[model samples]
Target: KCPITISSYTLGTEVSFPKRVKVAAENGFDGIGLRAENYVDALAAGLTDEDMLRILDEHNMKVTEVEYITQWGTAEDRTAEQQKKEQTTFHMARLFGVKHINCGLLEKIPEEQIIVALGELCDRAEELIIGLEFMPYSGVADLQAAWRVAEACGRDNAQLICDTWHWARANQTAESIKNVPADRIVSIQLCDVHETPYKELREESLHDRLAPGEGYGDTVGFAKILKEHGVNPRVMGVEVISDSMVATGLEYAALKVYNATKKVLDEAWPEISPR
Candidate 1:
């Protein structure tokens, strides 16, 4: 089963990693998901692996997953470029004492090329079990596309990362979630948003998301659907990237996000054990 966790990416655009750790621990979170850039920030914050482990131990926090280390499945060919990205993310994962890293498709490449590239990436991740994410607007958008890549790669290490926003944005449904094998569901990116359609270049809609249950996206239904599929991803990560959320201050945003998520989880997985 996935732990109840938060993705630090939604905490704030500018908060330091230490501050994120403190916030998550104080608010009763089991863990925080770190991105590649955040790993650098954590290192710059003077955090040693032992120090990190101690901090999380004190606050009872865990490093569940690290992610969006894009550029893996996007290159024209699976050569040194993809290898470098995986190596860097893998090193960070080892240092953080986490086992999974998330990746997305490169929009410039076609799905066929993406599968080939992902096959190469999974070959490497087999040594470490790094997880891959396929987001909407990326070349491999939605769960169907995600599964296609996973099946073609045919590696036990290559798994799916599901994000609610991308699922809605891509018109992917709860039915899509059912199609995914429970074991292949690596992680989830959780968030709620207004009913507005997201347009990347439109920019206006870029940061308009809200905490779960604060928006119109049927987050309860979304969460329940996943539960019905028996897909308890390793982490239910809050990955909201809204300008408004950032403006609300990291602590408050995290608190709100966590509270909202707890509500969803209560309704969806009421019998889950707290780890």
Candidate 2:
């Protein structure tokens, strides 16, 4: 069966560490996604690294994705906090045995400079995959730009992450996905969006995303596109970051998204759909 993951942000950031894993396991997720901030929250909550690992083992689950790395456009541009956060991602990947580190570029910078910095970041990552996402509201605004930047980095570890929300918001089509090879797509985030976009795109993105197949994002079509393009994404994550959905409680949110995604893949990508 094709595995599915609940991205770290799918549950509100304030949820407890144990509850996060427990909720995912109960909802039938194959794994979970963790950001550096989430890891720190676990540690601060007094769960040691070994404790976290034990919890994951007990649930028969793993952290399949690590992410939200930003501001690697230039050496001097990195703040102390950004560098530390970057280090934590590598650390998390090593400990969790996850290969890809999810990343994005909110900082506006030259594409050439971004490529150079990405190489530097990829070099630091060594064997880990640096999965850069292209968000319409961000600097790497589309598949064309993201693929060019990641490909230019000259590191095999440098790859791309495609999210249905961003794919729709950027107005990218199935043909546009043809430009990059399937293996280059290290991760696929699943979510839907409203029929009309909010004027504040970022706000809509962070606070009002829909479950897979829940809105007008054409999620089944997106799935058909990825399937046709032959993308065997390493991590398939459900990243519905809606405030209202999560406010309903973690179990409600997880089961809703999990079942919704199952229905989507069932219709559009049955080969990967859940039982």
Candidate 3:
């Protein structure tokens, strides 16, 4: 069975970590993704790691991954402040015993610099997996470019995160997915997008994504490609970041996204049992 994870972005920033964990469990999610800020917020709210783990245990939920570190690769070297933040995120991942952490390229850095930075980060990470997600508006805008960085990093844990919305927006072909080594893809995020490109791509990505099967993106085809390639990710995350859905309240939003995603998987890959 493929485990279904609820991306923290799907729930928006207003929801607390404790509430997010509860909602993911109640809605039948196998796991939930946590953001670095959310983890800090949980600590500020007097939630110990034990407290959080107990709640997850009560719901039989695992932490899919912790997201995200930005500007990990930049033209300018990482400032002392940035390094401190990155260290905190790494420490939290170790504390949570999370197997994966998401990293993003927000700035344009030289390819060689990116490779060196990633290798250093991976070495520091030790056993924790680091996956890079490419956004259309980011420096690494496509799967091919992201894959190049991963391959050059020369770390076994260096991998890519294929988000359906980003994949379609980047104009990545299913054929490319087929060509990639399965080990390079550590995780996948599921979401749909409108047929036409948005005028403000960044805003649209943050506030206007559709649930799987509800929009024009070819999510089913994406899933089929992964299956055909024998790519079973550690976690399959639902990342529907819609303003409309969030306005409807957390419970409604969570259940709707989960049900829509479940339906998409059921039709797309019936051979694999659902979460």
Candidate 4:
């Protein structure tokens, strides 16, 4: 295993929790990222947290990346729906003993609100770091924007997640990563992009990502920059969220992603661990 974690969406939305971890482990991933939707999917399938842990133990795999508590940027006093979702991520983070939680902002909120909201989440998380990500078309549209909000939050745990697709889509290069310290980049989700973005960036992001080192995007260079920055990311999540290839079979998709990710990482960031 390469110690990389496969994000839940890599296998598409319909996977059972057991099948998710099994395919990832069989393909040599050290861990998997569990979004709340998947976590709930596991529960709906009648497995308790203990059962989840047992599966991990059986495969020697870990849920290293627990993710995706958004809507905080827009709500200081979150509604029950959002709060329940947010707490679920917090609960998952603690259960898995993950160092950080993946977060993002799709709502176009004010920068001031974003900063304040981030600090608030850090307060709630306490010991767990908040790895905030920037995507094209998001409120925090790029590294500089995301980092600015993160820093202004004025909390030690406010951190960054530099997804390669987002970086490329934002028209940023690896050299732009120099703007922040490597330690501040708490997570990294790896994927390659087509030479031409979809009509809308969101379309490309969700349904059309390529496995690392296979597309036109310079995935090796992205990892090279992160490595040179001394980034030992908390979640090296391989999230090639493609719709077509994954429909073929979960294990087949996992194999392609892991092998391509291995090539990219081996060439550019040999120091990263699946553990």
Candidate 3 residue runs with Cα over 4 Å from true position = 75-77, 271-275
**Ranking, lDDT, top scorer first:** 2, 4, 3, 1
> Which TM-score value belongs to model 1?
0.89
Error of 1 at 134 (Å): 2.7
Q: By the lDDT metric, which is better: model 2 or model 4?
A: 2
Judged by whole-model lDDT over C-alpha atoms, candidate 4 comes out at 0.86
Backbone clash pairs for candidate 4 read 3-274
For candidate 4, lDDT tens digit of each residue in 80-141?
Answer: 98889989999999998788998888888889988888899899988889999998888889
Q: Per-residue alpha-carbon lDDT of model 1 for 60-162, expressed as tens digits?
A: 7788877655666544444675566567678867876677788876565777777777787777766666566656666776787788778887777888877
Worst 10 residues of 4 by lDDT: 266-275
Which candidate's TM-score is highest? 2
What is model 4's C-alpha RMSD?
1.8
lDDT of 2: 0.90
Which ten-residue region of model 1 has the weakest summed lDDT? Answer: 198-207
* Model 1 error, position 241 (Å): 2.0
State TM-scores per candidate: 0.89, 0.97, 0.94, 0.95
**TM-score ranking of the models:** 2, 4, 3, 1
Question: Please, what is the whole-model Cα lDDT of each candidate in the order they appear?
Answer: 0.71, 0.90, 0.83, 0.86
TM-score computed on alpha carbons, candidate 4: 0.95
